[PDB]
Design an enzyme around this catalytic site. Structure first.
Site, short mmCIF file in Angstrom:
data_model
loop_
_atom_site.label_atom_id
_atom_site.label_comp_id
_atom_site.label_asym_id
_atom_site.label_seq_id
_atom_site.Cartn_x
_atom_site.Cartn_y
_atom_site.Cartn_z
N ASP A 35 0.84 -1.19 0.00
CA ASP A 35 0.00 0.00 0.00
C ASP A 35 0.88 1.25 0.00
O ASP A 35 1.37 1.66 1.05
CB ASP A 35 -0.88 -0.02 1.24
CG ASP A 35 -1.79 1.18 1.32
OD1 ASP A 35 -1.89 1.92 0.33
OD2 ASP A 35 -2.41 1.38 2.39
N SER A 199 -0.63 15.56 -12.03
CA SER A 199 -0.88 15.20 -13.42
C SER A 199 -1.13 16.46 -14.24
O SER A 199 -1.66 17.46 -13.74
CB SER A 199 -2.09 14.26 -13.49
OG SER A 199 -2.50 14.02 -14.81
#
Ligand SMILES: COc1ccnc(NN)n1
EC number: 3.4.23.22
Length: 330
Positions: A35, A199
């Site tokens: 994770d 992004s």
């Protein structure tokens, strides 16, 4: 040193991936959920409340000659899906794919929430976010990667998750045969303890690319791609009959639909998520309404590039003094 381990989807729709981890001496192999959005290595154990164990493999520290109670240490964690666990702490030898760390904090669960009990395939979590998020008190502990870093050939790990198929976590090296083209690296902020990046935009299907900054985290422990409501609405508007359902808890779409791809930007590069990756299947057995893989982050407080996005890429988690992320197509 290096390590390399295969990671395998827990179920048919890739709700999560499990990777075998050797703990203790002799080894006890548990299948952990790696994770990159958390920083605790915790396991079902011989200390877990018996009624909260249902099919998981447990760690028994009393059977490990290298286990040592970390005196006074406790831990307690809550995840973004509302699940939680807590317990005490041992140090022990932990190996992943041939890479060994001695003295790793292994957090033994005394209590786990119902969603953990109900999932027999996940024996615990191995956190790969920054150690500043580790919950052990009163002495915070380091992640497996942080402990291994100095020994690794290069201070990196890579995630290569499969679509409906196994993939690979590598530690200490870049496998240049595992991706196509080049890896585009992008800046990371560690201020929230995550692999947080920005992004450069998105496209829906064959549509034009929208240049827009989307800050979010690379999180292998989250199943779905969680993005701003504007972006998510633009995606699902291209699927006839798709709608946000408050009762189901997100966007659903007719199972008869063919889903468009979704592209996200990494610098000037583009990662394309095929439409099929966005299908999480009938909302209940036999239903013709299917649960979407792109969902709004509006109620989270952060955008999350979970497995839906990451499995479309070869992803480099570069833990150099100034961390960065790399993405390549594959
Ligand atoms: C992957 O997350 C979810 C949530 C709710 N339903 C489903 N699939 N039917 N997936």
């Amino acid at each position: 040193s290096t390590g390399s381990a295969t990671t395998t989807p827990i179920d048919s729709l890739d709700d999560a991936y499990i990777t075998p981890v050797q703990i203790g001496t002799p080894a006890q192999t548990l299948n952990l959920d790696f994770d990159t959005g958390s920083s605790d290595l915790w396991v079902f154990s011989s200390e877990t409340t018996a009624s909260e164990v249902d099919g998981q493999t447990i760690y028994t520290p009393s059977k490990s000659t290298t286990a040592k109670l970390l005196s006074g240490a406790t831990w307690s964690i809550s995840y973004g899906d509302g699940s939680s666990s807590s317990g005490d702490v041992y140090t022990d030898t932990v190996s992943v794919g041939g890479l060994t760390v001695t003295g790793q904090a292994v957090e033994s669960a005394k209590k786990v929430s119902s969603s953990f009990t109900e999932d027999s395939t996940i024996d615990g979590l191995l956190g790969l976010a920054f150690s500043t998020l580790n919950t052990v008190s009163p002495t915070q502990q380091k992640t497996f990667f942080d402990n291994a870093k100095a020994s690794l050939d290069s201070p990196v790990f890579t995630a290569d998750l499969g679509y409906h198929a196994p993939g690979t976590y590598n530690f200490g090296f870049i496998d240049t045969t595992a991706y196509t083209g080049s890896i585009t690296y992008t800046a990371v902020s560690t201020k929230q303890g995550f692999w947080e990046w920005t992004s450069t935009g998105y496209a829906v299907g064959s549509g034009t690319f929208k240049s827009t900054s989307i800050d979010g985290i690379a999180d292998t422990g989250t199943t779905l791609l969680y993005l701003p409501a504007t972006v998510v609405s633009a995606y699902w508007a291209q699927v006839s009959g798709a709608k946000s359902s408050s009762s189901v808890g997100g966007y659903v779409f007719p199972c008869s639909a063919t889903l468009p791809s979704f592209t996200f930007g990494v610098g000037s590069a583009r990662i394309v998520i095929p439409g099929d990756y966005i299908d999480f299947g009938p909302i209940s057995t036999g239903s013709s309404s299917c649960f979407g893989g792109i969902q709004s982050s509006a109620g989270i407080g952060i955008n999350i590039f979970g497995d839906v996005a990451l499995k479309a890429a070869f992803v480099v988690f570069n833990g150099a003094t100034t961390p960065t992320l790399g993405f390549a197509s594959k």
